[PDB]
Symmetry: C2
Subunit: 152 residues, 2 copies
């Protein structure tokens, strides 16, 4: 499975987009000497370990930056495939609750309710890749359906 995980990370346009964003938001250059697989591994967290993360802080800013990078990765693929310039906001309260928003023109291309944000993560690389791909596809379908709104 170890050969297959490396192939998924390096082949998937979604995972590649996500790796690009993580590296772009790296103040100290901490990821510079490590593989893509290592860079994205914090997104994959066993269900059981995930369920056990405390909701008591405000969200850790690193976890918050993971969720921003996930949505920016989705936004960058929408922009690549449609030409629509997209912006991203992740708004969370102290409870881990809020919204991930991606918009281009006056069109909402992702408008996702976030809950228990401290526990953000996915069982496997496959589930990460499939969920980010699906959201990007659906955003793309929206831009194709509503150019009259995308151009505003």
């Amino acid at each position: 499975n170890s050969e297959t995980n490396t192939l998924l990370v390096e082949q998937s346009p979604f995972l590649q987009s996500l790796v690009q964003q993580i590296r772009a938001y790296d103040h100290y250059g901490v990821y510079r000497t490590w593989t893509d697989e290592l860079v994205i591994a914090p997104y994959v967290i066993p269900k059981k370990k995930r369920r056990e993360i405390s909701l008591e802080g405000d969200i850790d800013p690193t976890t918050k930056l993971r969720i921003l990078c996930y949505f920016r990765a989705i936004a960058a693929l929408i922009e690549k495939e449609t030409g629509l310039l997209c912006q991203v906001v992740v708004d969370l309260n102290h409870e881990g609750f809020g919204w991930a928003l991606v918009w281009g023109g006056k069109l909402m291309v992702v408008s996702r309710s976030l809950r228990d944000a401290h526990r953000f993560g996915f069982d496997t690389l496959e589930k990460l890749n499939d969920q980010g791909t699906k959201l990007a596809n659906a955003g793309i379908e929206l831009v194709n359906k509503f150019p009259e709104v995308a151009r505003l």
Copy 2:
């Protein structure tokens, strides 16, 4: 002073604003205050406003006022269109970010915010005019684009 007190009573925007301020006052900390007095924090003369320091983290109290302002705008849009948009105010420690109001898949208002520590308006009329203008632009947009607004 008389036209001000009256405007607070009469203005659909100012009435919406007051309602929001008091909805976020879970412990009735403002129950003995007049409507006009609960609006006063939004009205800060420019000389004074330009001396609020930008050097530290924007005050959580100021963030809540910006949220209430945008929720007032959304409530006016709901009043005239039936559609109540969701509101987000996303700000930096540095006071930069976005005020977003959307309904269905329509971005009804989207304002980039800078130096938000200094949020506020020279006079009551200026607060009322701006809130009203943004709500009226939002109502027009909702009625122009129901194919996305009403999803």
